[PDB]
Design an enzyme around this catalytic site. Structure first.
Site, PDB file in Angstrom:
ATOM      1  N   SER A 149      78.737  53.657 -46.827  1.00  0.00           N
ATOM      2  CA  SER A 149      78.144  54.926 -46.397  1.00  0.00           C
ATOM      3  C   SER A 149      78.481  56.080 -47.321  1.00  0.00           C
ATOM      4  O   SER A 149      77.849  57.137 -47.212  1.00  0.00           O
ATOM      5  CB  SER A 149      78.617  55.353 -45.005  1.00  0.00           C
ATOM      6  N   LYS A 176      75.988  58.384 -49.209  1.00  0.00           N
ATOM      7  CA  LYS A 176      75.161  59.384 -48.544  1.00  0.00           C
ATOM      8  C   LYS A 176      75.514  60.800 -48.964  1.00  0.00           C
ATOM      9  O   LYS A 176      74.644  61.681 -48.939  1.00  0.00           O
ATOM     10  CB  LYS A 176      75.270  59.233 -47.035  1.00  0.00           C
ATOM     11  N   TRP A 202      73.273  52.468 -35.954  1.00  0.00           N
ATOM     12  CA  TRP A 202      74.039  53.638 -36.387  1.00  0.00           C
ATOM     13  C   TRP A 202      73.145  54.727 -36.977  1.00  0.00           C
ATOM     14  O   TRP A 202      73.315  55.175 -38.112  1.00  0.00           O
ATOM     15  CB  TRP A 202      75.205  53.311 -37.316  1.00  0.00           C
ATOM     16  N   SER A 248      76.815  60.059 -40.796  1.00  0.00           N
ATOM     17  CA  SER A 248      76.576  58.806 -41.495  1.00  0.00           C
ATOM     18  C   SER A 248      75.328  58.099 -40.981  1.00  0.00           C
ATOM     19  O   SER A 248      75.254  56.869 -40.974  1.00  0.00           O
ATOM     20  CB  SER A 248      77.791  57.887 -41.434  1.00  0.00           C
ATOM     21  N   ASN A 293      72.159  56.181 -40.568  1.00  0.00           N
ATOM     22  CA  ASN A 293      71.587  55.200 -41.491  1.00  0.00           C
ATOM     23  C   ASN A 293      70.091  55.404 -41.691  1.00  0.00           C
ATOM     24  O   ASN A 293      69.594  55.331 -42.824  1.00  0.00           O
ATOM     25  CB  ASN A 293      71.863  53.783 -41.002  1.00  0.00           C
ATOM     26  N   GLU A 333      71.476  46.630 -45.964  1.00  0.00           N
ATOM     27  CA  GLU A 333      71.891  45.592 -46.902  1.00  0.00           C
ATOM     28  C   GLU A 333      72.992  46.072 -47.846  1.00  0.00           C
ATOM     29  O   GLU A 333      73.847  45.278 -48.260  1.00  0.00           O
ATOM     30  CB  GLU A 333      70.680  45.119 -47.706  1.00  0.00           C
ATOM     31  N   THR A 336      82.930  59.533 -45.763  1.00  0.00           N
ATOM     32  CA  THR A 336      83.537  58.226 -45.563  1.00  0.00           C
ATOM     33  C   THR A 336      82.537  57.100 -45.821  1.00  0.00           C
ATOM     34  O   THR A 336      81.318  57.290 -45.819  1.00  0.00           O
ATOM     35  CB  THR A 336      84.005  58.098 -44.110  1.00  0.00           C
ATOM     36  N   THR A 387      82.396  52.695 -44.571  1.00  0.00           N
ATOM     37  CA  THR A 387      83.037  51.585 -43.876  1.00  0.00           C
ATOM     38  C   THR A 387      82.129  50.374 -44.022  1.00  0.00           C
ATOM     39  O   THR A 387      81.073  50.300 -43.388  1.00  0.00           O
ATOM     40  CB  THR A 387      83.281  51.923 -42.406  1.00  0.00           C
TER      41      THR A 387
HETATM   42  C1  LIG Z   1      78.699  53.511 -43.531  1.00  0.00           C
HETATM   43  O1  LIG Z   1      79.453  52.919 -44.279  1.00  0.00           O
HETATM   44  N1  LIG Z   1      78.266  53.054 -42.352  1.00  0.00           N
HETATM   45  C2  LIG Z   1      77.565  53.900 -41.386  1.00  0.00           C
HETATM   46  C3  LIG Z   1      78.282  53.931 -40.043  1.00  0.00           C
HETATM   47  N2  LIG Z   1      79.479  54.910 -40.077  1.00  0.00           N
HETATM   48  O2  LIG Z   1      80.493  54.559 -40.929  1.00  0.00           O
HETATM   49  S1  LIG Z   1      81.268  55.775 -41.771  1.00  0.00           S
HETATM   50  O3  LIG Z   1      81.480  56.883 -40.708  1.00  0.00           O
HETATM   51  O4  LIG Z   1      82.600  55.358 -42.089  1.00  0.00           O
HETATM   52  O5  LIG Z   1      80.380  56.276 -42.760  1.00  0.00           O
HETATM   53  C4  LIG Z   1      78.619  52.526 -39.560  1.00  0.00           C
HETATM   54  C5  LIG Z   1      79.363  51.720 -40.619  1.00  0.00           C
HETATM   55  C6  LIG Z   1      78.593  51.686 -41.936  1.00  0.00           C
HETATM   56  C7  LIG Z   1      77.339  50.818 -41.916  1.00  0.00           C
HETATM   57  N3  LIG Z   1      77.498  49.538 -41.614  1.00  0.00           N
HETATM   58  O6  LIG Z   1      76.242  51.324 -42.165  1.00  0.00           O
END
Ligand SMILES: *C(=O)N1C[C@H](NOS(=O)(=O)O)CC[C@H]1C(N)=O
EC number: 3.5.2.6
Length: 263
Positions: free
Chosen positions: A43, A46, A78, A103, A105, A141, A208, A210
């Site tokens: 993420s 972004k 998300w 974050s 998507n 993906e 961030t 993840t």
């Molecule tokens: C980003 O990595 N994602 C978006 C969402 N939030 O995570 S973050 O707050 O750490 O950015 C869920 C996890 C992840 C994803 N799988 O899209």
């Protein structure tokens, strides 16, 4: 050596890989640990996506307040903000804030489409002098975080250098740079990461990531101390190689602490 050992010990306890780059913009001092290795962005791309939008706003009047109408087919898991505006739509700026601060998507995919896709964002990063960043795929993906896969990766040093150019340097005009800073400052997802390492009376903007593999996560930030110049830093991890017990957030915070203490 002395600089590397606290990071190596933190990394040994974590069991995966950690990458750290920090720069003190007042003195030019840096901290570097695996800073040129590639790590999945997930993420965290972004933030740079929102910066690319702002770069386009230097040339296209009204872009930020332009509504993007999307349907259910644009939504993916998300997408907490975009799921609430199916019937009303969202503007480019609203999508950018959602992508940065929640974050979101679907918002990220909609903005990628506006910018010419992953290749378009990569071209923007090249245009600011980042030769390491690459985005190759869309949400979801791009979160696959396959070991050794260079798709959708950058390095801690390249992330930090690009972040500095975009928030404190010359890669965006001042109003755009301030909007980027404001979006980062209002992020809601980083309260356990770099922000956990900073004194309360400082200020932080961060983004961030993840990834789809526990233990692969990241955060980058601009940190504004009181009475001295800002610090820019990036902390990325890769999971231990050959279920939520990797403490990736604690490791990110701990690495950020060492960087701010050692700088
Ligand atoms: C980003 O990595 N994602 C978006 C969402 N939030 O995570 S973050 O707050 O750490 O950015 C869920 C996890 C992840 C994803 N799988 O899209």
């Amino acid at each position: 050596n002395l600089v590397a050992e606290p990071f190596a010990k933190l990394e040994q306890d974590f069991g995966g890989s950690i990458g750290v780059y920090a720069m003190d913009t007042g003195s030019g001092a840096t901290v570097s640990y695996r800073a040129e290795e590639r790590f999945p962005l997930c993420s965290s791309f972004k933030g740079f996506l929102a910066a690319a939008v702002l770069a386009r706003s230097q040339q296209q009047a009204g872009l930020l307040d332009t509504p993007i109408r999307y349907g259910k087919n644009a939504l993916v898991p998300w997408s907490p903000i975009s799921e609430k505006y199916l019937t009303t739509g969202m503007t480019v700026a609203e999508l950018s804030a959602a992508a940065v601060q929640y974050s979101d998507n679907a918002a990220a995919n909609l903005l990628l489409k506006e910018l010419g896709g992953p290749a378009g964002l990569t071209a923007f990063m090249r245009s600011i002098g980042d030769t390491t960043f690459r985005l190759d795929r869309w949400e979801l993906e791009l979160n696959s975080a396959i070991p050794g896969d260079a798709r959708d990766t950058s390095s801690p040093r390249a992330v930090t250098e690009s972040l500095q150019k975009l928030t404190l340097g010359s890669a965006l005009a001042a109003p755009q740079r301030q909007q980027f800073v404001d979006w980062l400052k209002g992020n809601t997802t980083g309260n356990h990461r770099i922000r956990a390492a900073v004194p309360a009376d400082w200020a932080v903007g961060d983004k961030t990531g993840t990834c789809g593999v526990y233990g692969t996560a990241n955060d980058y930030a601009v940190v504004w101390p009181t009475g001295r110049a800002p610090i820019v830093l990036a902390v990325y991890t890769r999971a231990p190689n050959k279920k939520d017990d990797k403490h990736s957030e604690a490791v990110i915070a701990a690495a950020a602490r060492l960087a701010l203490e050692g700088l």
